[PDB]
């Protein structure tokens, strides 16, 4: 279709205005103070949020090239999100400030890569500097410490993420259920997680955590690519019945096969859900086994001679709930017997002293841990549906800052940690005038944060901005009482984890927004 | 329906206009310096790109003249890309230089045709003088040298394409399958590879490469023409079993069977890819058979009375793997005995014995060097998957780029060898003024690929320009580090096969729109 | 009237544009290669100058703001013309340049007041540089090689002017005359000038040097101020018989009796010019009878009881010739009698004796020297009225440029001074950043005169800015006949006069524009 092109600053000033809509909508949500935006909706009261989040994904705008600015920035905010699991926001915040400098120092003749450059190395200096702020996340008395303040000063959540992490180690998986109704319950199920997502959206039956949940479903394990719905018809209605939701695990699941899947599970007609099987080549076969001897399933692999067609309910594996992200299928308490599971333990634990390469060796103690590791299960207390529901929700949240806190550590929060980084750069200097400038462009990024926190409580942002620059270490603003202190002896605490990548994203964009010197899109017509 | 019709000038600043935009949006994203162009998506994230061909598939102009100049040169890249695989954004904007000057030469009262025939002398001489200048890249050394540059300084790359052609020859076959995991590995198997791509699109089923790749598929080898589908049937369902994909080797695949055959493999339902049989007439035939004894497979020929109807999995061939391009078939490790190869080699051998006639020896020759030649096979390294995938298509474009420079050797690259080959025609002259003023139009783009790489850069064309002029020889100027020196020592090249396309085509298609004096087109309505 | 209002952003780019359309269409007239500019006439053909001033004036824009901006630095053209007569092209291409890198810092936000410290302080030192790079023209020799180049290589023009000042000396005043035929002529006649210059304009006669000329008039000399018309009456109609002009040069001339001078003098009615008396307080007393002593005319001041009413045209002084410029007025040739005049100056020569005071003793020197200096006039040759008339102007032009020489030396010409002079200051700094960038705006605003030069040739700017900043000294680029080589050894100079006024001037409006924040101007109405 015709396109419309545009060059230099006309494109210039396209994507500034569509970025400064965005950031403009979702910057007034940041902090404690943070204002509420309102959302339509065609049906219904709207929407009234002061989560950053929910604003951004409704930002869409007519006019074509602030449009696509806008859709840019979303982006990496969203990758700040799934990376590190919170900080859209900030990390919008920090992309309208450098993106907005940057593009004047543009228009102003200075050179894009050089600018770029500089943005670059501010950033690089900075997340170093940035770990000398961290105060480590080690110890179950800081791991209680993180939760508690995550789950707004609920000591309880605190004691349950301990106590879980304590049991399968502050790298293992966790996950949070309802509970059976009052009082928590903490226990290690056979479980395992490996690193692959859903085929495809739409998978998706919990828009809230953008992932896919099945309860006692059953799971198919074909050891070979499904391009033909065909072979899925006797399984398919084989798991008609019984009622129960199908997880089809095969080597890859590609669009014939999958395209009527995400149209009959979109019409309730069976409820099924595909992912790829972990690793690649020969270890993928062996793993997939392994699933198996979990979920008491059979592999359906074409090597022995085995069809889709002639497989029963009796050859599918099945665990009690399974739940995928955008890129992680975690399986909670299969079926398979402790007999056949330790015993494949034990196998491969001789693999391991046969082995004889460093490479098969760790890859072997990789299924160990996996298929010998479980998963540690957090049953929500309850007294009420209602507030059971609720908790739930935080201790999911607090358990996800605890352990990106266990990753790097925690920081002050409030935007002063950056801003504490940026206030010791002022000497950083890179390779020419312009690069200098784009140095500054970020150290004065890195304010604003902060200034929006305190811009929304009604202060003057510079005033605090200055008395905050002025002391040292963890000295800042508390936003919520409106009073100066130490951000760590206060409780406000952002992990290092989600500082670092809301910072990183930002200027990932920033630097590609500046460097962008023609956008192409469909004519208005 | 009625249309609108334009005639010289008015045609004339219609083309020009069309191909402005086109060469403008493609040309800011050459060389080191290269900018993004954001290119709009429906749904998305708009893609940001600073790959040429990528921009130049967008364009499409609202007015349908200006449309018709951008579609015109457009062709100049993807000549360019089909002949070289790279340098579609340098032959974009020689085309762009030369056009222009045309253009505004003709407008100025000049002989359409005598300009043009001097853009072509001057071509003409260019070329000739281009591989004089041009260094050869024969022994290893050298062969790994460009292997390793191609690979971004990676001497493990390097040292693989070096090898692999010393298995089986720089004009051997060469391909690169992901490994086993940790370490490279390389071996010969027998294979073959014939000038002939898949018989329509779409049969990619990995449009990364643009091309299709199936794993230990069958191989049927018709001796005729398939135009209806029902000789397929019966054959086609055998393939359906035993779950294999079906390569179709026939004389042609007509409209009728082949549009069936992209219906279905588009349903999952049987995966195949067909192509046309290598050489044609008698030579045809005896090639075709080269392929069975390869493959273990038996050609049905209509001469012998056979029919497609009556065959089985029996007659089929059979290769681990095979992979087709726009223009190339390679069967990868086939199934047949060296025994029936090695044998049918010997027979060939005879026949260049007995050959009467040099052509006749020549291809005779040509057939004996597939069949015994082999194939070269590179795994690449791992350590995860991801890394893995990513070696490997370093590894591809350094070998493409290495097998380039074999052919026809490398020259100094930043767009200093069409500066020096400039200044070596600056004597040239045509049969009158008009000659001579199209001699020079094509001397001056020739130093536009230059100068824009230097424009990318945010530094001065003409005084760089000025400045690599000045000097001789290998020297010119170093983008990445801004710096002049010697483009050889810095390991800047460029095969000397994409730099003659680029001008080749550049000057094809900007004779043509030079000597165009009517435009046609529908009416917008 | 209703005003029309407006702010920072929105007052510059208005201000930009206008200074834009002044200055481009000024600046292609400069140098040897400057191009014509055609200005319509209201009746019969356009004026086709190479001349700056005579384009500036013709520059009114139709949008109220961009028209003040274009006025404001018309400003600059016009006070370097009245302090150097020559540069105000030079001046308005460095205005220009100036302006808009000022502007462009002010837009992305740096400080205005800072911006225009930076560029004042770049400019003292320059101008301390220029004096430093300056030769002297000192000696009769120098004064004849500069009088001669500014003469296009006349020798003997060069002669002249250096024989003119050897009787006077080279402060002493000067003038040239039609000569009576072949053979130029140089006598020195009792004369005087004065720093007064006309009471208005209008009086000018002689729009080509916008200066008022006088032959063989009557000259009043009141002491005291008219504002009456009544008491000039009797003396006016004494001086509309005899037929001769009349210059007053009283103690002012206020509204009422100037206005009708004016008018009178603006309908043929007796040709009448005024100018202020010579100095202030009680010294304008003794001055403005040395004037009398020459004229031979008869102070009438009321101390004396004397009224205009009763004068004569004998109480009035009368000279051969009068000329006065914007603020200079010299009185050619005298009738007073060398007896008078001669004792005249015993008598001031004997205050010098008995002098208790430097200043009394200096200014009584000022009125010796002015008395008994005289003035040399230089009657230009011939041979046809034509080649008379012509070569007079050539007199004119290359007297007035050795004036300057005389007064601060020479430096290169070609706009290498400037560049030298930048080059001198790469390290020069200021306060703060945004002062840095100031000075950077005004060294790189040094580099417009040789780059519009070049460009006005046809040549590249940056290309040539280039290489002559790669030589030293006088090394620079002759545009006529576009060969380096050494400035001085060609000819080619300045008068580091209006070098330095160009850049004040330039500097001094820019300064005040990029520190502008609203304008005000009547509604389009
Ligand atoms: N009392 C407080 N004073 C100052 N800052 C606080 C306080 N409490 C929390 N914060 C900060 O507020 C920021 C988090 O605010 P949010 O509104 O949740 O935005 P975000 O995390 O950047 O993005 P979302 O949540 O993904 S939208 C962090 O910088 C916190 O440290
Ligand atoms: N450091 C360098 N300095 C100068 N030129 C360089 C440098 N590195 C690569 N080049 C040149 O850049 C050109 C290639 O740039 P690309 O952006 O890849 O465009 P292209 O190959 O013309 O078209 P594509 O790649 O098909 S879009 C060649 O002239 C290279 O020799
Ligand atoms: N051969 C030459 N090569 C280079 N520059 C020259 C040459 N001859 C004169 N010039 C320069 O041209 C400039 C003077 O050009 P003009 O066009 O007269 O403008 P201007 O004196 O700045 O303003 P006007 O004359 O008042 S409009 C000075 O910088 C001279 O040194
Ligand atoms: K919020
Ligand atoms: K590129
Ligand atoms: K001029
Ligand atoms: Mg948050
Ligand atoms: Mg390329
Ligand atoms: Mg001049």
Redesign the pocket.
């Known amino acids: 279709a015709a396109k419309d092109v545009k060059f230099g600053n006309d494109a210039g000033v396209k994507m500034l205005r569509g970025v400064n809509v965005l950031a403009d909508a979702?910057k007034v949500?940041?902090?404690?103070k943070?204002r509420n935006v309102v959302l339509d909706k065609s049906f219904g009261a709207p929407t009234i949020t002061?989560?950053?989040?929910s604003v951004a994904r409704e930002i869409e705008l007519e006019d074509k090239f602030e449009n696509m600015g806008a859709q840019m920035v979303k982006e990496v905010?969203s990758k700040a999100?799934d990376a590190a699991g919170?900080?859209?926001?900030?990390?919008?915040?920090l992309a309208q400030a450098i993106i907005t400098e940057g593009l004047k120092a543009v228009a102003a003749g200075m050179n894009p890569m050089d600018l770029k450059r500089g943005i670059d190395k501010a950033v690089t200096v900075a997340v170093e500097e940035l770990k000398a702020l961290s105060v480590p996340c080690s110890d179950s008395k800081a791991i209680a410490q993180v939760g508690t303040i995550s789950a707004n000063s609920d000591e309880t959540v605190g004691k349950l993420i301990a106590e879980a992490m304590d049991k399968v180690g502050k790298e293992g998986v966790i996950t949070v259920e309802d509970g059976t109704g009052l009082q928590d319950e903490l226990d290690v199920v056979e479980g395992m997680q490996f690193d692959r997502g859903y085929l495809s959206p739409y998978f998706i039956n919990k828009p809230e955590t953008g992932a896919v949940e099945l309860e006692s479903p059953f799971i198919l394990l074909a050891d070979k690519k499904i391009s033909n719905i065909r072979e899925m018809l006797p399984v398919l209605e084989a798991v008609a019945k019984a009622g129960k939701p199908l997880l089809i695990i095969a080597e890859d699941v590609e669009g014939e096969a999958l395209a009527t899947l995400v149209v009959n599970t979109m019409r309730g007609i069976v409820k099924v859900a595909a992912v790829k099987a972990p690793g690649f080549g020969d270890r993928r076969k062996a793993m997939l086994q392994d699933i198996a001897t979990l979920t008491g399933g059979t592999v359906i692999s074409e090597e022995i001679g085995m069809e889709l067609e002639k497989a029963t309910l009796e050859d599918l594996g099945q665990a009690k709930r399974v739940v995928i992200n955008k890129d992680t299928t975690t399986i909670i308490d299969g079926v398979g017997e402790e007999a056949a599971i330790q015993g494949r333990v034990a196998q491969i634990r001789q693999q391991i002293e046969e082995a004889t390469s460093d490479y098969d060796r760790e890859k072997l103690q990789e299924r160990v841990a996996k298929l010998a590791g479980g998963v540690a299960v957090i049953k929500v207390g309850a007294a009420t549906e209602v507030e059971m529901k609720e908790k739930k929700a935080r201790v999911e949240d607090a358990l996800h800052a605890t352990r990106a806190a266990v990753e790097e550590g925690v920081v002050?929060?409030?935007?002063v940690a950056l801003i504490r980084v940026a206030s010791k750069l002022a000497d950083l200097r890179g390779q020419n005038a312009d690069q200098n400038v784009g140095i500054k462009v970020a150290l004065r990024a890195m304010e604003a944060?902060?200034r929006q926190?305190v811009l929304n409580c009604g202060e003057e942002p510079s005033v605090v901005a200055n008395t905050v620059k002025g002391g040292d270490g963890n000295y800042?603003?508390?936003?919520?009482?409106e009073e100066y202190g130490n951000?760590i002896d206060?409780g406000?605490?952002?992990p290092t984890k989600?500082?670092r990548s809301?910072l990183q994203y930002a200027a990932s964009v920033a630097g590609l927004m500046i460097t962008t010197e023609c956008m192409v899109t469909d004519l208005p017509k």
């Not at 800042?476 to 009482?481: H, K, R």
């Open positions: 979702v949500t940041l902090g404690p943070g002061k989560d950053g989040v905010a999100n919170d900080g859209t926001t900030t990390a919008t915040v002050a929060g409030g935007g944060p902060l926190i800042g603003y508390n936003a919520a009482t951000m206060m406000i605490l952002d989600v500082t809301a």
